[PDB]
Ligand binder design. Sequence first.
Ligand SMILES: O=c1ccc2ccccc2[nH]1
Ligand SMILES: [Ca+2]
Ligand code: NA
Length: 306
Amino acid sequence: VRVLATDLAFPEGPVVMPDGSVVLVEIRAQQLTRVWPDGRKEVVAKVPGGPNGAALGPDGKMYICNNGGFGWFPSRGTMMPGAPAPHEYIGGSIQRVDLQSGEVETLFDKCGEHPLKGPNDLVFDKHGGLWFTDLGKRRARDMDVGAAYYIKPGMTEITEQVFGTLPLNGIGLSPDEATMYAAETPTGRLWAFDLSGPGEVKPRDVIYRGEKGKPICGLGGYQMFDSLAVEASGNVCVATLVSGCISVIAPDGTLVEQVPTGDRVTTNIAFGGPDLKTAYITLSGKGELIAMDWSRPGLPLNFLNK
Ligand SMILES: O=c1ccc2ccccc2[nH]1
Ligand SMILES: [Ca+2]
Ligand code: NA
């Protein structure tokens, strides 16, 4: 276990480059940041609002889930995200950053007639379609439902694929891309959505209240999920809040293991390095990017690793 960088303002959305550098977002600093393996840092772009998740796109640009902004309040020695005051929330969107110029473009701020609320994380399929989660926003006495969306290849249009769940956070594709996984934050449940084809959830039979997917795993106790990354084996590695670990879930739902990280606010994971057997993990409470040896290889991401 190795600490690569410190003094990051709530790191998230790690994208591990082939050379082992990491481009990540700092939600509280509202920026996209390049982190080199020795700890030296460079700001790539200012991204006002709440840049929350990142993924390299087929056009070579860095696509960003912008949750619109958080309130920030001190808790357990860390500045934690909270419900934003109206003046702290500028609207959720999907954005794109030219890494060489720092230019930021806003691509979508609605799906149909409904504004996007709190876009969180995202993953590309091999065709260039873009899956992403919406965590929703919190307000003083209520909160938005979760959702998942798909933007068709070429960034032509956005469609609603999952709606009405609790806040959704991590999202990933199986190796064969026939299954999309969404992590539900407050319940610590990983939901598996069968796809009839690229970008299209195949609705499953309801279990209790309008479920479109299968809850293949739900952790016990007081454990919540954040973002995730998939292994070439098909296992889903989910950053686990409160207990502070990576939860490795097999495609069948089995809890393979839990890898402690030392931070109750462990938020994301991404694979890179030789054989993609290195796990790069954002400890957002401590403000750190860490590296860890992984026993199995990561799933190469489209347009970054393959
Ligand atoms: O992606 C996110 C977004 C919000 C958030 C808040 C508290 C802890 C982890 C979080 N991860
Ligand atoms: Ca997240
Ligand atoms: Na990730």
